[PDB]
Design a protein around this ligand. Structure first.
Ligand SMILES: [N]S(=O)(=O)[C][C][C]C1234B567B89%10B5%11%12B5%13%14B%15%16%17B8%18(B961B%18%152B5%163B%11%1374)C%10%12%14%17
Ligand SMILES: [Zn+2]
Length: 257
């Protein structure tokens, strides 16, 4: 029932998921002048060399690439994190035009899209258990701006025609998510939540300062997807982003000066 439209969008979500109005909701605006450099923060450790992608899926809210998370193959550690977080999937949020689409904003600036690599804490054993914990998930967030093409995104873009509508999926093996990363791993971090229902307050957010550049042709292919199932009135999958939420009693910390 939930979505991003007038009648089921972010302003409605609190009725089914009252934590929508909680103390540690995501996304937020990153005020770069207020974020405190924290020299105790470690560099982020991103170990994706043995990542095993499985499937690409249109879930009705975004598209996602799922990975084998039954061993420590593709893991996030270090940074603000204690212990080891396994990559489960990545997905994106994007706009109807280039001036909106990201969930986090930086000094109120919206990017055209935002990539989320979702990882869960292996000390909880599975992702259902992890989402019930305040340190269950770590989501690595990467901004997209429109410019030059991102070569490492092209293999994703070229199969989107095969998953146009909600429920469709396809084989998507041997995809290397290292090809989605910017040069710098400089980041901001804060405690937050899932940005979709169930909005569980279980996420350590790690948002990279450096955006990736994607081409107008790449993002245009995101915009051809459909929220609807096949045979329903065609409603383009665009503006699938939750707006910034109140920061409340939270501090955003920077890994960099
Ligand atoms: N936009 S976001 O905060 O990364 C939430 C992404 C959606 C999900 B929530 B649940 B938790 B894990 B799986 B399923 B839904 B799916 B993934 B994360 C599980
Ligand atoms: Zn997301």
């Amino acid at each position: 029932h939930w979505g991003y439209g007038k009648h089921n969008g972010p302003e409605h979500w609190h009725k089914d998921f009252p934590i929508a109005k909680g103390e540690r909701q995501s996304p937020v605006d990153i005020d770069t002048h207020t974020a405190k450099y924290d020299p105790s923060l470690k560099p982020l450790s991103v170990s994706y060399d043995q990542a095993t992608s499985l499937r690409i899926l249109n879930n009705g809210h975004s598209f996602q690439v799922t990975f084998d998370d039954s061993q420590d193959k593709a893991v996030l550690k270090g940074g603000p994190l204690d212990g080891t977080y396994r990559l489960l999937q990545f997905h994106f949020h994007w706009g109807s035009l280039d001036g909106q689409g990201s969930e986090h904003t930086v000094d109120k600036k919206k990017y055209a899209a935002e990539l989320h690599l979702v990882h869960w804490n292996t000390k909880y054993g599975d992702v259902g258990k992890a989402v019930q914990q305040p340190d269950g998930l770590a989501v690595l967030g990467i901004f997209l701006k429109v410019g030059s093409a991102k070569p490492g995104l092209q293999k994703v873009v070229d199969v989107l025609d095969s998953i146009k509508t909600e429920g469709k999926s396809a084989d998507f093996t041997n995809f290397d998510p290292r090809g989605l990363l910017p040069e710098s791993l400089d980041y901001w971090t804060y405690p937050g939540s899932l940005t979709t229902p169930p909005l569980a307050e279980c996420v350590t957010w790690i948002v990279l300062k450096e955006p990736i550049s994607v081409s107008s042709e790449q993002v245009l292919k995101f915009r051809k997807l459909n929220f609807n199932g096949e045979g329903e009135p065609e409603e383009l999958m665009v503006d699938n982003w939750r707006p910034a939420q109140p920061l409340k009693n939270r501090q955003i910390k920077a890994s960099f000066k």
